[PDB]
């Protein structure tokens, strides 16, 4: 019961590496339960635009999304080293616990 946990700020690299990891685990046919899409946390900081406070008080709205996914599989726990060597694309980082 080893669960690999993926996190990024963009959806497309995370979707490519999750598709590649389930393709590498469906080619060897371990039991893989599919990607479980955890809800996105928006970090929003709403600051004022003007550096001295003189104008017509227009406000500025920043945000950043965190996309949080996982794959869970039942296997021997040293077979699991060979799948996480194809997943080294930037953005997405991998946290593994048992």
């Amino acid at each position: 019961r080893i669960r690999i946990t993926l996190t990024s700020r963009n959806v497309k690299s995370l979707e490519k590496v999750c598709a590649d990891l389930i393709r590498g685990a469906k080619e060897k046919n371990l039991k893989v339960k599919g990607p479980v899409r955890m809800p996105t946390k928006t970090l929003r900081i709403t600051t004022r635009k003007t550096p001295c406070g003189e104008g017509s008080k227009t406000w500025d709205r920043f945000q950043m999304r965190i996309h949080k996914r996982l794959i869970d599989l039942h296997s021997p726990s040293e077979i699991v080293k060979q799948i996480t060597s194809i997943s080294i694309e930037p953005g997405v980082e991998v946290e593994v616990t048992i």
Binding site: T7, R9, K41, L43, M64, I66, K68, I88, P90, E93
Partner: protein
């Protein structure tokens, strides 16, 4: 331990301070940006520069010095950082490198207009579609004003200014 959000924020502050410090040291090197790639055998930091021979110093003194100062300042461990230099293909399509080149021409001193027209001519000869250079300040006499140097076409609004327009 620490949150996912505070981890993402603190790594973003690491990108910000690393690019700001590398701009403040490396004016001469053709510094345009940095590239982090982290694997737990060795954490790899890739510098974008157009001239590597000023990145190294004396037989590679300043790149091992740069490895040492990033190891010292951010609290990095003994032997997890090594430092590379990637060659950028086009200097005329990176605004940071050409912004430093115009800065170095005008700081080493030239007419402002022949500097800006050499930059606009090289950018339109490198294969871009367009350019715009504003050099503003105390240009002629003691009263400041705007001087704009354009050639070709430019897109100004919408979402395609985020991936078709390079600025500095």
């Amino acid at each position: 331990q620490i949150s996912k959000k505070r981890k993402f924020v603190a790594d973003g502050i690491f990108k910000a301070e690393l690019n700001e410090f590398l701009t403040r040291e490396l004016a001469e090197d053709g510094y345009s940006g940095v590239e982090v790639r982290v694997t737990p055998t060795r954490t790899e930091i890739i510098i974008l520069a157009t001239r590597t021979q000023n990145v190294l110093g004396e037989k590679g003194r300043r790149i091992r010095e740069l490895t040492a100062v990033v190891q010292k300042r951010f609290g990095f461990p003994e032997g997890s950082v090594e430092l590379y230099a990637e060659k950028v293909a086009t200097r005329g399509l990176c605004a940071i490198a050409q912004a430093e080149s115009l800065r170095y021409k005008l700081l080493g001193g030239l007419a402002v207009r022949r500097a800006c027209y050499g930059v606009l001519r090289f950018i339109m000869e490198s294969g871009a579609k367009g350019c715009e250079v504003v050099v503003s300040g105390k240009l002629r006499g003691q009263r400041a004003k705007s001087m704009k140097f354009v050639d070709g076409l430019m897109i100004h609004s919408g979402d395609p200014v985020n991936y078709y327009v390079d600025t500095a």
